[PDB]
Every structure is written in structure tokens, then in C-alpha cells.
Design a protein around this ligand. Structure first.
Ligand SMILES: [Cl-]
Ligand SMILES: [Cl-]
Ligand SMILES: [Cl-]
Ligand SMILES: [Cl-]
Ligand SMILES: [Cl-]
Lengths: 311, 311, 311, 311, 311
């Protein structure tokens, strides 16, 4: 089987369509997601043309082995997709209507700067390499681009499934390649994060601030240091799941700040004690009294600044 | 091989049946379960009809390649099922009795709102895409829908295996699709949870409440903060296994409340100490004395309110 | 290829044998184990009979494709076994001697009640579905049922590999099925458990009991609470590996009891301090003095009671 | 199909080219990386030459089964690559232009000495075993060696993708083998490491140094020991991911040093207390006062010696 | 294809040879390792003999399907190896030189008694089952037994790759089986263990011994109990990776001893305090003073005893 010949010198247009059946396994660390969808393909191969009257059928059905099928691949996949041809339907003009159900593990980079209030655009890149006999160009049949209403991605709200109609035609290793960008828009379900991660993490930090209403150095050392351990332990408990980003993340900057606050609270506790011990309780008392306002205010200010910078 | 032709303009009825052999690997986080079952199919292909008396045989056996078989798929699977055709049998009227043994990883969303006192309905959706020559419609042979008595799902009580007889017939990408809902009803084995999770978690919280029979600020800081660490450590120890739900969970609400209680207990401890130190031991004593009743009562009340809202 | 025809109306006997080559990957949580073994099959097919005299050969060798072979499957496997036919040999009377080497992941429920002093019976269920032309019944050739001496299962002592000779014949999906129970008896290597799990866990609990020779409330709070954290930390450190059983386990009952003891020790510590502070040191002293005997004795007694109930 | 025959006694040159499409799953512990790329092959087989004039077509397309193709393998792979032949092109002179898309898990050792400021050279070794009829030699077509601009490796900056043009010819199992070294140069994105790992780890150590402005042995024991726990807890929290190197690593040395510092800080704390208790507070005070400078200075210095020693 | 016939009644000798290309994934817990190697096979099949003079060829090349090849399997594999036939060559006498590249996961038990100062012998058992027409016996071509110089196994030094020339011929299920033992000698890279595991673990234990230069019961309880937690935490941090051995390990015995030492240190701390409180400070002081020498000496003595017993 060779590709269909051109009537003049025109390229072959392969009309594509992806219909999302199932969407699952979004791995934040791997920056991968698993997909189960229909891939629809349509091209004209006149060699297959028939007379409905002589054939006594309006549409002819073929096996994948019987006819020529364009070699469509996905660019950003781990391994080649697991596909199962559902139907091949030839109308008398020689128009082929191909359909397969496939599953694939798609590699799409993520932007963690606004985590856990982040939205993402997942890409599925369709590609076709042109042959020596003729050039193959991809196209989008928008009526065949969709997603099942039941499509769920644990932890995300599925916004839209669309395709950038204009293909990216370019040369590679001395041949033409026609690329198609299919986009899945998702936004994270940040609800759980408040009572699950944020609130208990803020309570632990607030406990350390009680050292500002105490003069007992032993009690204060216990408050600061034990809370620091509790903070780390709590972090171990919470599945962050995030990879090592080359840039600074919102949640990342806050976490760093929380570590700084434990350190500053220790300095204060240490300073207050030294002044008291070094017979200057007036200074020690003024520092502690200030800290009571200073700590929450500086925290609240720095968080507003952070939020502003990130959003 | 083409589909059997219609006598009039009627659709082809494919009688289905799933018989559960093995059920395993229910992943609470992935919302997936693995299955090993029989898939029975039945349709009429008059082209295969025979005279039993002339043939000498009451039943003819065929190879999958030899005859036309409808393309049945599962909607909510990760990849296509691993199937092995067990038997194909033809009766004189052209009735085909197909049977295959398959294994598949099924995606079924779970409702964690009542965890660990939750019950679930696991779905296995059967589907068939209609062809150009005729429409294909799914049906349920109830005598062919069952489950092996030995079927076990670690941590769950298997209630029932049934099918919603009425198929969901709908159009998809310009063709008819007939869908069948097979339901596996399971309820969680919540026994272990009491002595394994709940009771030790309540004991740790109760230990923090002893700070209400103490005036030693050092001892009290140690009680509240060390128990908070113990709580987090205990949580790390216990495999919750739950994913990040967009909604609020029963266990989730209680856990949040337990974190609030550790924070309030710190406030009390802090307040009592400040009043004592600021020469007002009468107030400090009344607060501590009240807390002794207030803490268990508010806890018990709040839990009752929550339980009521969730059940 | 069709099944061999009956002389009268008698069923076909398939003589089976399993010889264990390798045994590995016993997963306590999944209740699965991996097996590598030989599967021997023997049955009479008179269509393959030959006169050794006019042929010159004592035995004829065939390819699996060339002759009819019964479709034997395993009931309790995740997916179908990976098999490789080693040999097929026909004796003059038409007796076929089949041999294949297979690997399979077998699902066999476990009884955790006596863990880590538990013994298990692992099941491998052989099955054959009868055909329309003839009924098939399984049998056990005991000379072909064995296990390699080198067979090891990390953490277990392999007791015996046997088969329940009498098959379980029953109806399934309107046809007869003949089932065979092959049993692998194993007992846990509980040695390591004493110096690795039990002993360090008892030492941590014993440290908490030193609070009965102390009057320092601060020191006592530290002893009881810090050991409770150490207990939890130690538990995190030790790989229990056990699933959530619907029933109560021996180890699980002890663990619960240990948690109760930490709680009771706190009550004592709290009570002793309150009495002392509330100017009644005689009662406080009697309680502490009693606890010194009460705690070890009640512990030793309830452990004897538990052990008795479980064994 | 036999190899093309030599005109004289010259070896066959197979012109190779690897074009990186996707790069993912760099496992620092396994020292493996997954790669999805094009493998281009070119060689002359005069048996496949044709007179363009007599033939009518300029390029003859073949199926892999139809013609002889050299058996190219990768040395450092876990299992054989998953390949899909994209195109086979024969020019009139018999110059074969082969192209396949493959995915493979490549084993490449890593140098952890400079972690997390390390750079790595990932190797992909191409190999061909010579046959009895003719010797086969590999070559690099530099115009066919590249990488997709979109190629990303989470946590690394992709520097270059090149090949060592001169193949490594050598004997193996009595025959000649021609090896090609393809090199992927990567450097670690060490940014995150500072605010995420280093800085919080230094803060915890700095908290331990406050014991040098305290005389309370109880407060000091709490500071040193509780920070040591916090350090270990923090380490548990941070995914190092590193394997057990036979050599000393930079990080490994700093981490070791941090453990030594906690031990020395304990000695000091212990010494200071003993002198005080043994009625020599002047020595105790001088030691503590010195430690305040000694600890940061010796730390800062040892780190410069370490940094220099490693870079 | 039938086996080559015997001239008399002699067995067929299959000359084997394994050449290690890649060695990876040594799992201490599973007692498994992954391998990528060449498998060379040689046997004489006179039916394939030819006159080189008339044939014009010195050697003839065959496809696996074309000729008879002995069924060689590995005993201690998880599933059957993934093999790819590299070459089949026949010399004028009918000698067959077979070569395949294979990957397999090998099950080889390990001896942990001397961990981390342990050396291991990894086994790869080659096997052939004899047929009805003739007996098959395995042999070792030593020139074809080797390993790639680049072979690395993270955490181990690869000593040698050899084969026990004399096969193990024995009967199994009424037929002869010829077994070959290929041995890979490896020794653990124990360097890292000292600064990474041993030294920090000894420092934590040494910190607990400072309680022998203190009279503060509160400080002593904190020292002993907090170090015990730190010890457990440190153990959690360090990847032991070891399975539950039926026997006692060296490292295992030391770890147990360290737990005993924390318990004895508590007893001392408790005893010293009780004597002091019960107005007998002279005894309390003598016990503490003795402990200072007793603890390190008994530790040192016992380790010498342990080292001696294990080495
Ligand atoms: Cl693909
Ligand atoms: Cl399916
Ligand atoms: Cl099976
Ligand atoms: Cl390869
Ligand atoms: Cl094998």
C-alpha cells in the first residue's frame, strides 16, 4: 500500500478530531496525564472509489491492513498510544472515515508559580510526516473535536477541549511535518487546601507567637522549637507532590517565609532572655511587647505583598 | 465479514452479561478497581442459521475470525481489556452465544463524604457503536449477570452485582451509541477503624485536656505541644489513602476540628498563665475550671452536629 | 481442531500436575503471590493413536497448533498466566503428555488473626470449562505434583505442596466446570520480630513506667508524652505491611492495649499531681506506689488473656 | 535476506542519526533516563539499485520485511527499544534511507560529587555486530543529529545533544563491533535548593547556637537535642533521591559536618554545665563566650575548605 | 523440525556462554537483580552439514524458524527472558553458532549476616529438558563467558563472572534435565555507611551518655528520651532496604543493642534520681560515676564480641 496519488501537485489533507472519553492520572511531579479518547481521521483515496449500484452498498468497510492509512503519531507521548480501530468507512468518492479508540500517557509541562490556585493548558500534539510521493497536511474537523460530559480529573475543573485549527507545518530531517495543537484547559480545585493544609499550618505558627506573652525562657524554647518540629512533621504529613521548579512558586515563597519566622521568633526569645539575664528588663519587655504586633503585622503585610506579586 | 442484515429496518440486539470471577485492587486515591470477569454476548445472524436434522449437529462452534462479532468496548477503562475468547456457539436459528474471559482496570468515581462509614456503587459501562448498514442496541440477559461467591475486595463487603436493564442510547460523532450500566454495590468494613484510628487519636487529644488540672506553664506547654506532635505523627502512621475531594468530608471535618482544639487549648494555656503572671489568679482559675467541662462538652456537641449533618 | 469424541457418553479426564519451580513476591497487603512452575496435562485422544509397529516410533511429538488441547485456566489469577509449551508427546494408544512452564500472580486471601505467628494455605485453582460435544473433568496425577527443593519465599517456611484430588464440579453460565484445589502450606518466620519489633516496643512502654518512681510532674509529663511519640515513631519505622482486616488481629489487640496504657499512665501522672497540689500527698503516694505493681501485672495478665484467646 | 556484498573487501558504512523528540524520567537513584527519538539509518545496497529511466519512479519505498536492514542495538538500555519504522527509501544507486521512532530507558552513570551544582553527560551507545560475509562500521550524519527545541527535563537545563564522530571499533564474542557515543549534556537547576533545602537547614543549626547565650542547662539540652530532631525531621521531609556512591559527595560532607556540629554543641553544653556545677564558673563562661565565635567561624571556614576541595 | 539424530545413543551437547552487557536493579528486599546479556548456544546438527567448495560459502546463515534450536530456559527468573536472536551461523560440519541478546529479572537469595560488609554470589541457572528422541546436555565454552568492562551495579564492586563447568544432570517429571550455574561475584561498597549511617547514629547514642555528668532529673529525662526519638527518627531517615531474615544479622544485633542501651540509660537515670530523692546521694553518685566508664566500655566490649562472632 502506497499513498493516494495527487490529481495535480496538491498535498493530502488529513482531517483530524479527538473526542475525550476518559481523562485521568494527572501527575504533578512527572508533568504527565493519561488519556482515553477517539481519534477520527478523514482523507480522500480515489483508488478506493466505487459505484454504489455495481457494489450494492452505499458505503464500503475495510480492515486497516487492506488500505493505506496515514501514519499519525503524537509528539508529546511517553510511548506510542494503545489504539484499537473502531471503524473504517469508504464512501463512493473514495472518502475514508477512520476511527480508533486510544489510550496514551501525555507529557505536558505545568506552571506551578500560582499553586494551589493554578490553571493549566494541557497539550496533545498530533503529527504527520510527509512522504516522497506527496505532502501530507493535517486539518481540524471541529464537529469531531469534543469531550464526554462525564470526563473528570480528580482535583481539577475541566474548562475546555479545543484545537488550534492552523497546523504548524515545518521541515524536519529533510521532510515536511504538519503538527496540530489540541488544548485541554483545566483549573485546580483549591477548596480542600484551606482546611487541610493552610489553616493547620497557620495554627502551628500562631502557637509559636504565644512566646511573646511569656518570660519563661524554658517555656519559650519549648514553644518555638517544638512548633518548628510540628511544622516539619505537618509538612511530611501533607502530600505537596510538586517537582523542583527552576523558578519561585507562590506556596514556595510562603513556606520559606514560615521557616524565616520560626528563626526570627528564636532570635527574639534568645534576645529577650539575654537582656533579662544581663539586668536590662526594660528593653527585654519593650522588644517582647512590640513582637506581639510586629510578628502578625509583618506576616500579614508580607503575605499581601506575595499574593500581589503572584496575582 | 459484514454485520447481519435487518429483516425490516430494526436494530440488532446484543444481549450482554458480565459474571465477576475476581475483584481486586480498589484504589481509593486513583478511584480505580481491577476486575477479572466473563463477558457473554448474544445476537442473531440468520446467515449462520442451519437445519439441525440435515447437519446432524444441534450446535456449530466457530473461531472469532470466521464470523462477524459486535465491537463491544468499556467506557470507563484505563486501556482496552485483556480478553480471551472462551467459546462461540451457534444454534439452528443463527443465534450466537459468545463468551470471553477478560481483565480490566476500571475508573469509577467514589463519594468520600461519609468515610469510613461509606458505601459505594462501582460502575462498569458497556458500549457499542452502530454501523452504516444497521443500528446496534445493547440488552441485559439477567440470568447471565452474576458474581463468584468467593469474590472478595479487601476492606469491603460485596453487597450486589446488577445491571440497569434500560440502555442509554445516544448519538456521538454522527452515529448511535448504546450504553449499559453494570453496578457493583460495596460497603466499607469500618470495624478496625475504631481501635486502630479513632480511639488512639482521641486518647492523644484527651491527654492535652489534662492541662486543665495544671498550673505549671512549662508542663502545660509540654502537654499541648507534645500531643500536637504526637497527633501529626499518629496521622503519618495511619494510611488515610484518600484523594483531594472538591467537597467537605465527615472525617475531614473532624480532623480539622481536632487541629482547632489543639489551637484553642494553647490559647487557654497561654491566657491562664498571663492572668496568673499579671496578678489575677481568680480569673485564671475560673477559665481553667470552665475549660475542664467546656472542652469535652463543645467537642461532644460539635461531633453530634457534624454526624447529624453527614448522616 | 474439535475435542476427542466419547466412546459412550463418558466425560474426558484431564490428568493435571503442578510442579513449583519458583515461588516469590508474597504481598501481605494485596494477598497475592507470584509463582513460576510446570503445568503437566494428560488426556486420551484416540484420533491420534497409532500402531508403533507400522510407524517404527514409540512416541510422536506435536506442535500446540497441530492438535486439540483442553483450555485449562486458573480461577484466582490477576491476568492469564504467561505460558511456554515445553513438550507435547503422543504414546501409541493416543495418550497425550503436555508440558508448559508458566508464571502467574495468584490472589489468595490470608488470615492475619495470629500474625506474626501465622501459618497460611495458599490456593491455586485449576479450571476447565466443558464443551458442547463432550464434558471435561480434571484429575490429579500425584506423581506429577511437587516442588523444587530450592523454592524459597522470603519470610516464610514452605511446609507442603499438595492437591485436593476430588475436583469441584459445578455449573457456570449454563455449562459444566471442573475445578482443582492445589494447596501451598507456609508458616511465617517470626524470629526477627522479637529483637526487631516486640522488644524495642516493650522497652519504650517500660520507660513510661518510670514515672511511678518520680514526683516531678514536668519530668513525668515528659516521660509519658515523649515515650508516646517514640512509640508512634517506632511504629512508623517498623514495616507492618498488613491490610485492613474486618476482624481483630492478635498484634492489633496488643497495639491497642499499648495505646490504652499510655493513656492510663497519663491519668495516673495527672491524678498524682492534682492530689499533691490539692494538699493530699498520702493518697498521691499510695496511687503511685500501687501503679508500680499494677501496671506490669495488669499488662502481663491481659497479654496472657489475649495470647490464650488467639492461641 | 543476506547483507549487501562488498565490491572489494571493504566494510559497510551505516550512517546514523538520533533526533531527540522527548526527554523525560531522569532517575538520580537508578541512574536511568527515558528518551523518545528518531533513529535514522543510511547504507548502500547495490542489489536494490535501479535504472531510474527503466523504472519510472525516483525513490522506491520498501517494507522492513522486504529488504535487508542492519541490526542496530543500544548498549546501555534496560530492554530493547520500542521502535516503529516511519519510512524506508531506496534511491536509484541503492542508497537506503531508514527512519524509525523509538522509546528507550537508558542506563547512564551519574557523578554526584558536586550535587546539587552538578552537570552531567548522558550517554546513548549505538552498536552494530559485524557478520561473516561483511564487516559493518557505524558513522555519524551530523545533519541528522539534533533535538526538538521543546525537549525539557524537569530540574535540568539541556545544554547540547552531540555525537563522537569516531566510532569505537573492538572485538566481542569472536566478531567485530562498531560503537557510537551520543552525548546529552545537562546541568542541574540548583535555584530552588537554596530557599527549599539549604536555608531552612542552616536556620535549624543556627537555633542550636543560641545555647551559647544561655546558662540554663535544661533550656540548652532542649535547644541542642530538639534542633537535632528538627534537622533529622527536615531531612526526612526533603527528597534527596541520591544513591549510595562509593565516593565522597559535597552535600554528603556538609551533611556529615552538620551532624558533627550537633555533637560538639552537646559537648560544649555538657562541659559548661559540669564546670558551673563543679564550682568553676569562670572557665564555663570563657568556653561559652568563645563558642559564640568559634562555632560560626569553624563552620564558615570548613565550608570554604569543602567548597574549594570540591570546585 | 525434530532434534538432530544420535549416531549411536549419545546425548547432544549444547555449548553455552553468557556475556554480561548490563547489570542493574539489585533489590536487597526482593533478592532480585536485572540483567541484559548475550546468550550464545552451540550444537552439531549433521543434517545441516555442507561442502564449502561446492557451496562457495564458508558459512550459511539461518532464520530461527528454518532450523531446530534447543529449548534453553533459566530456572531462577520471574518470567521468561525477553530475547532477540542476533545471529545463527552454520559451518560445513553442521555446527550451529546461535546468539541472542536477552533481558531478565533474576531471583537470587542473599546472605545479610555481614551487612553492610557483605559479599554475594549471584546465580543464573541455565537449564535444558531432554526430549524423547535424545538426551540434551549443557556445556560451557569459556571463551564465550564474560562481562562488559562498563558493567556497574550501584553500591557494589563487580568481582568476577564465571560458570561452574560441570553441569547438574538430574531427573525431573520422568525426563533428564541438565543445569548450569553461572556466578556473578559482587562485594558491597561499605564506605558511605560510616559517615552516612554509623557515625551519626553513634553520636546520638553518645549524647544520651552525657546524662552521667548531670544530676538534673528533668535534663536527664530529656537527654535520654529525646535521643531515643532522634535515634528512631534517624533510622526512619536511613534506607536500610533489608528484608526480614530468618537468621540474626550483624547490623541487626548492633541496632538491638543500641535499643537496650537507651533502656539501661533510662534505668540508671531513674535509679540515680530515686536514691537522691530517698536521701542516699552517696550511692546515686557512685552509680553515675561508674556508668561514665561502664557504658562506653560495655558498648566497646560487646561490639568486639559481635564483630568476632560475625567475622
Ligand atoms: Cl502515538
Ligand atoms: Cl474495552
Ligand atoms: Cl490463566
Ligand atoms: Cl536496542
Ligand atoms: Cl527463560
Amino acid at each position: 500500500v502506497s499513498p493516494p496519488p495527487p490529481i495535480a501537485d496538491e498535498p493530502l489533507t488529513v482531517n483530524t478530531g479527538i473526542y475525550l472519553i476518559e481523562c485521568y492520572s494527572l501527575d504533578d511531579k512527572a508533568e504527565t496525564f493519561k488519556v482515553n479518547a477517539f481519534l477520527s481521521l478523514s482523507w480522500k483515496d480515489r483508488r478506493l472509489a466505487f459505484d454504489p449500484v455495481r457494489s450494492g452498498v452505499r458505503v464500503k468497510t475495510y480492515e486497516p491492513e487492506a488500505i493505506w492509512i496515514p501514519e499519525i503519531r503524537f509528539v508529546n507521548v511517553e510511548n506510542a498510544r494503545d489504539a484499537d480501530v473502531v471503524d473504517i468507512s469508504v464512501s463512493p468518492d473514495g472518502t475514508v472515515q477512520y476511527l480508533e479508540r486510544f489510550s496514551a500517557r501525555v507529557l505536558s509541562p505545568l506552571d506551578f508559580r500560582r499553586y494551589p490556585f493554578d490553571s493549566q493548558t494541557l497539550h496533545i500534539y498530533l503529527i504527520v510526516r510527509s512522504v516522497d510521493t506527496r505532502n501530507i497536511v493535517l486539518a481540524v474537523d471541529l464537529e469531531k473535536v469534543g469531550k464526554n460530559d462525564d470526563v473528570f480529573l480528580t482535583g481539577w475543573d475541566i474548562e475546555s477541549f479545543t484545537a488550534v485549527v492552523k497546523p504548524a507545518n515545518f521541515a524536519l530531517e529533510d521532510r515536511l511535518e504538519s503538527k496540530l495543537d489540541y488544548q485541554l484547559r483545566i483549573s485546580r480545585q483549591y477548596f480542600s487546601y484551606i482546611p487541610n493544609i493552610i489553616l493547620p499550618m497557620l495554627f502551628i505558627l500562631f502557637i509559636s507567637w504565644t512566646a511573646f506573652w511569656s518570660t519563661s525562657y524554658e517555656a519559650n524554647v519549648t514553644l518555638v522549637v517544638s512548633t518548628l518540629i510540628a511544622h516539619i512533621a505537618f509538612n511530611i504529613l501533607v502530600p505537596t507532590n510538586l517537582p523542583k521548579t527552576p523558578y519561585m512558586t507562590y506556596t514556595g515563597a510562603i513556606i520559606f517565609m514560615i521557616y524565616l519566622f520560626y528563626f526570627v521568633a528564636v532570635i527574639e526569645v534568645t534576645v529577650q532572655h539575654y537582656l533579662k539575664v544581663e539586668s536590662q528588663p526594660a528593653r527585654a519587655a519593650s522588644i517582647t511587647r512590640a513582637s506581639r504586633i510586629a510578628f502578625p503585622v509583618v506576616f500579614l503585610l508580607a503575605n499581601i505583598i506575595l499574593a500581589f506579586l503572584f496575582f
